[PDB]
Amino acid sequence: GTSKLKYVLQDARFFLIKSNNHENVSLAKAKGVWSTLPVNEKKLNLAFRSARSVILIFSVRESGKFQGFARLSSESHHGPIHWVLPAGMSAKMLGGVFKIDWICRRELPFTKSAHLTNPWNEHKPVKIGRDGQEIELECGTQLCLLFPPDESIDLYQVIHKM
Ligand SMILES: O=S(=O)(Nc1ncc[nH]1)c1cccs1
């Protein structure tokens, strides 16, 4: 069913996350963590205090798909995730580490979200946006509901953290 999923997304905020490679999304799925650059880290920390749920929707650059979505369970904290960093991306260049609970680990191709435009990015298709781009509530909710159901996930424990 979709009822607990809809409850988790109620009055949520949504942010597009762009990962340079698949390895870091795989690590995030395995370890329940994410890190971003300080400009986006500040935005997510503000949002985490401000909303019942902050949802990160992940897309690997050039993949043509989203790889799933997750809910922040903490603000960022410091003090060492073995991110696969491209040349020019330093471990210190990143911010802290956010803990996340995956809501859906399944893929969604961009072809299936072509009817969804993001008011906060000039009504461009929701697939379009820089890392950290906020997605307006209605568009973000509909995008999350397009993903295939992930039957491996039990949202009972996530609801209790709200
Ligand atoms: O360098 S990434 O593969 N992608 C990225 N987007 C914006 C800054 N970095 C990475 C993902 C997670 C830790 S490091």
Swiss-Prot record:
Highest taxon listed in the record's lineage: Eukaryota
GO terms, biological process: dosage compensation by inactivation of X chromosome; in utero embryonic development; mRNA alternative polyadenylation; mRNA export from nucleus; mRNA splice site recognition; mRNA splicing, via spliceosome; post-transcriptional regulation of gene expression; primary follicle stage
Effect of residue 34 to D: Abolishes RNA-binding and ability to influence alternative splice site selection
Residue list for modification Phosphoserine: 90
Coiled-coil features, chain-numbered ranges: none
Alphabetized GO MF terms: mRNA binding; N6-methyladenosine-containing RNA reader activity; RNA binding
Reported effect, residue 59 to A: Does not affect ability to influence alternative splice site selection
Impact noted for substituting residue 130 to D: Does not affect ability to influence alternative splice site selection
UniProt effect for mutating residue 37 to T: Reduced binding to N6-methyladenosine (m6A)-containing RNAs
Effect on the protein of changing residue 68 to I: Abolishes RNA-binding and ability to influence alternative splice site selection
Binding site for RNA: 18-20, 34-35, 83, 131
Result when mutating residue 83 to D: Does not affect ability to influence alternative splice site selection
Listed result of changing residue 56 to E: Does not affect ability to influence alternative splice site selection
Domain YTH as annotated: residue spans: 12-147
Signal peptide (from-to): none
Functional note: Regulator of alternative splicing that specifically recognizes and binds N6-methyladenosine (m6A)-containing RNAs. M6A is a modification present at internal sites of mRNAs and some non-coding RNAs and plays a role in the efficiency of mRNA splicing, processing and stability. Acts as a key regulator of exon-inclusion or exon-skipping during alternative splicing via interaction with mRNA splicing factors SRSF3 and SRSF10.
Protein name: YTH domain-containing protein 1
Source organism (scientific name): Homo sapiens
Gene: YTHDC1
Residues of the full protein shown: 345 to 507 of 727
